Amino acid sequence: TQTYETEFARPLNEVLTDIQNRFGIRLKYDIDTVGKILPYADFRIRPYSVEESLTNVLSPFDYKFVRQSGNLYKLKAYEYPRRTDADGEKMLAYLNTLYADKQAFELRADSLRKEVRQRLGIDTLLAQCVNSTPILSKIRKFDGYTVQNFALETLPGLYVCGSVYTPQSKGKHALIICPNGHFGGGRYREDQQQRMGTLARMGAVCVDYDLFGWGESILQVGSTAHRSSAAHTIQAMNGLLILDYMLASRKDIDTKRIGANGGSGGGTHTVLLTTLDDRFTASAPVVSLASHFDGGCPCESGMPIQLSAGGTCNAELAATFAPRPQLVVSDGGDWTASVPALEFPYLQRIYGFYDAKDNVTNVHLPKEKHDFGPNKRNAVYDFFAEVFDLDKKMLDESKVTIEPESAMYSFGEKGELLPENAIRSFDKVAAYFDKKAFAKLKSD
Ligand SMILES: [Zn+2]
């Protein structure tokens, strides 16, 4: 019954099936429309445009479409971290109106650094971090580099576990902090060991560490806890405390050569690190950078850092590092497809404010997909070789050992070495962020 008096109301699932048949498209559904009723459904249709029709029937339920290949469309929930290339181009054009030189750029960059840090809440948690003796494994020797595991206590009872990759070559070394993306196996994976081992053979101390609720963090908080705003703050805190610990505990580091490098989520965390800490002298965010995507995981976008200074994006945060050497690796199979046309020229103009366009580079892999495969690693090897004066003759992944996973563990094959004091539920961490969690906890 289509009447004025029943608001010409149709179930949304009938409307969309009807759009699919009428305009001859295919729909992939990543939403469940059960029970959804759209008033005036047929009046929202536009015979000349499948896209207006879809947007007019979906935006009332907070849904959208994303055009796939050919005549296929995916139907999605609104995503606060994800916009379009078009949104990107308007954002970056808008931010270009806020600065015409170094002076104007540098005032906004300082506001961006302060408001990002404030909005992350990291200084609240740093004021509560302890100073206990880090748990260090024995040093394991390999061809031209060694590996040593660490567990560093942050908040009372909370541990970040990682591994340090040290060159065997004599003399002062570069240091590279290496947050990782959501790739299978985390920092334990083959391509992560390859990259840390090659950079260490070439003369860089390299450090990698568990994402919150990955690896041995699972022993304390479980796997679910990773997708939380807590993860965003805790992972940035982890990076900073690890940089502090490396610089205070080691004699072999040249403080003119401190790098950040990571892939996907690790590339988002790389930009966060160079935004939070002025000690970094070079940066390589890999298959990560976009004006129009902030990161899909709450560990990347869970805190509202992109609302800093009236609105920013990871491309502008990356720009605040100017004019320090920075490599952006992009590919044609993900959100970084835009970088050669959009994000890179934006970064070139800002590096331009310092006569240092040559300090920022883009290795675009048009044919490749979202991974940390060999040509991603080769752009990283090449960049740090160049800017940190590392030894390219040592570059050979066949010489890196692929340790089994448990060899990088701090707390034993089965986590049986997990300290007495140690947090064993997410509740203990959540209580720093949410009064509901604190209240659950305080009723023993
Ligand atoms: Zn994450």
Ligand 1 center–CA 210 separation, angstroms:
11
Instruction: Give the contacts of 104 (CB within 8 A, at least 6 positions apart).
Output: 98
Helices (H), 185-306: 190-201, 218-221, 229-249, 265-276, 298-301
- To which residue do tokens 């404010």 refer? 353
One-letter identity of residue 307: L
Ligand 1 center–CA 226 separation, angstroms:
6
Distances (CA, A) of 150 to 143, 162, 165, 207, 434: 21, 5, 11, 10, 30
CA atoms within 13 A on the CB side of 310: 6
CA atoms within 13 A on the CB side of 362: 26
Instruction: Give the contacts of 53 (CB within 8 A, at least 6 positions apart).
Output: 19, 23, 44, 45, 46
Which is nearest to 308 in space by CA: 297, 296, 299, 320? 320
Number of H helices, E strands in the chain: 15, 15
Instruction: Give the contacts of 135 (CB within 8 A, at least 6 positions apart).
Output: 150, 151, 159, 410, 419
Distance in angstroms (rounded) separating the CA atoms of residues 268 and 315: 10
Distance in angstroms (rounded) separating the CA atoms of residues 369 and 263: 13
- Residue 103, H or E segment: helix 102-120
Long-range contacts of 353-361, Cβ-Cβ distance < 8 Å, separation of 24 or more:
353/99, 353/101, 353/102, 353/105, 353/322, 353/323, 354/102, 354/322, 354/323, 356/322, 356/323, 359/322, 359/323, 359/324, 359/325, 359/326, 360/322, 360/325, 360/326, 360/328, 361/326, 361/327, 361/328
Ligand 1 center–CA 419 separation, angstroms:
25
Distance in angstroms (rounded) separating the CA atoms of residues 178 and 192: 9
**Contact at 8 Å (CB) between 149 and 137?**
yes
Ligand 1 center–CA 294 separation, angstroms:
12
Ligand 1 center–CA 352 separation, angstroms:
33
Which is nearest to 122 in space by CA: 237, 43, 22? 237
Taking the alpha carbons at both ends of the chain, their separation in whole angstroms is 57
Token output for 296: 């899909």
In terms of phi and psi (left: phi > 0; alpha: psi -120 to 50; beta: otherwise), the region of 350 is alpha
Ligand 1 center–CA 401 separation, angstroms:
27
Distance in angstroms (rounded) separating the CA atoms of residues 147 and 132: 22
Ligand 1 center–CA 265 separation, angstroms:
6
Q: Is the peptide bond before 374 cis (omega within 30 degrees of 0)?
A: no
Ligand 1 center–CA 287 separation, angstroms:
15
Ligand 1 center–CA 37 separation, angstroms:
35
Which is nearest to 180 in space by CA: 191, 172, 169? 191
Angle between helices 265-276 and 102-120 (to 10 degrees): 110
Question: What is residue 277's DSSP assignment?
Answer: -
**Contact at 8 Å (CB) between 365 and 329?**
yes
Ligand 1 center–CA 111 separation, angstroms:
26
Q: What angle do CA 291, 296, 299 make, to 5 degrees?
A: 105
**Positive or negative torsion for Cα 175, 305, 373, 403:** positive
Ligand 1 center–CA 413 separation, angstroms:
25
Ligand 1 center–CA 122 separation, angstroms:
17
Resolution in A: 1.9
Ligand 1 center–CA 318 separation, angstroms:
19
Ligand 1 center–CA 301 separation, angstroms:
9
Token output for 323: 């004019």
Ligand 1 center–CA 339 separation, angstroms:
22
Ligand 1 center–CA 180 separation, angstroms:
9
Distance in angstroms (rounded) separating the CA atoms of residues 160 and 99: 39
**Contact at 8 Å (CB) between 253 and 246?**
yes
- Residue 369, H or E segment: none
Which is nearest to 235 in space by CA: 271, 268, 211? 211
Distances (CA, A) of 249 to 151, 175, 252, 353, 413: 14, 13, 10, 37, 27
**Contact at 8 Å (CB) between 280 and 242?**
no
Ligand 1 center–CA 187 separation, angstroms:
13
Ligand 1 center–CA 189 separation, angstroms:
16
293-302 b/e (C-beta count within 10 Å ≥ 16 → b): bbbbbbbbbb
**Contact at 8 Å (CB) between 36 and 78?**
no
Distance in angstroms (rounded) separating the CA atoms of residues 27 and 72: 6
Ligand 1 center–CA 59 separation, angstroms:
28
Ligand 1 center–CA 266 separation, angstroms:
9
Residue 417 burial (CB < 10 Å; 0-12/13-18/19+)? Answer: middle
Distance in angstroms (rounded) separating the CA atoms of residues 296 and 178: 20
**Contact at 8 Å (CB) between 284 and 332?**
no
Token output for 95: 């931010």
Strand-pair partners of 207: 164, 177
**Contact at 8 Å (CB) between 27 and 15?**
no
Question: What is residue 158's DSSP assignment?
Answer: -
Strand-pair partners of 172: none
CA atoms within 13 A on the CB side of 196: 30
**Contact at 8 Å (CB) between 207 and 178?**
yes
- To which residue do tokens 């009064």 refer? 435
Ligand 1 center–CA 139 separation, angstroms:
30
Ligand 1 center–CA 297 separation, angstroms:
5
Structural domains of the chain, with CATH: 4-77 (3.55.50.30), 108-408 (3.40.50.1820)
Ligand 1 center–CA 268 separation, angstroms:
10
One-letter identity of residue 395: L
**Contact at 8 Å (CB) between 220 and 249?**
no
Distance in angstroms (rounded) separating the CA atoms of residues 398 and 382: 17
Give the CA diameter of the chain: 84
Instruction: Give the contacts of 235 (CB within 8 A, at least 6 positions apart).
Output: 179, 211, 212, 269, 299
Ordered DSSP codes for 231-262: HHHHHHHHHHHHHHHHHHH-SSEEEEEEEEEE
**Contact at 8 Å (CB) between 390 and 211?**
no
Q: How was this structure determined?
A: X-ray
- To which residue do tokens 């064993």 refer? 424
**Positive or negative torsion for Cα 432, 437, 442, 444:** negative
Which is nearest to 344 in space by CA: 386, 290, 296? 290
Ligand 1 center–CA 299 separation, angstroms:
4
Which is nearest to 273 in space by CA: 245, 224, 238? 238
Distance in angstroms (rounded) separating the CA atoms of residues 364 and 328: 8
Residue 6 burial (CB < 10 Å; 0-12/13-18/19+)? Answer: exposed
Ligand 1 center–CA 56 separation, angstroms:
33
Distances (CA, A) of 300 to 81, 213, 313, 341: 9, 14, 12, 24
Ligand 1 center–CA 169 separation, angstroms:
35
Radius of gyration of the chain (CA): 24
Residue 311 burial (CB < 10 Å; 0-12/13-18/19+)? Answer: exposed
Ligand 1 center–CA 316 separation, angstroms:
21
Instruction: Give the contacts of 251 (CB within 8 A, at least 6 positions apart).
Output: none
Ligand 1 center–CA 81 separation, angstroms:
13
CA atoms within 13 A on the CB side of 274: 33
Ligand 1 center–CA 348 separation, angstroms:
29
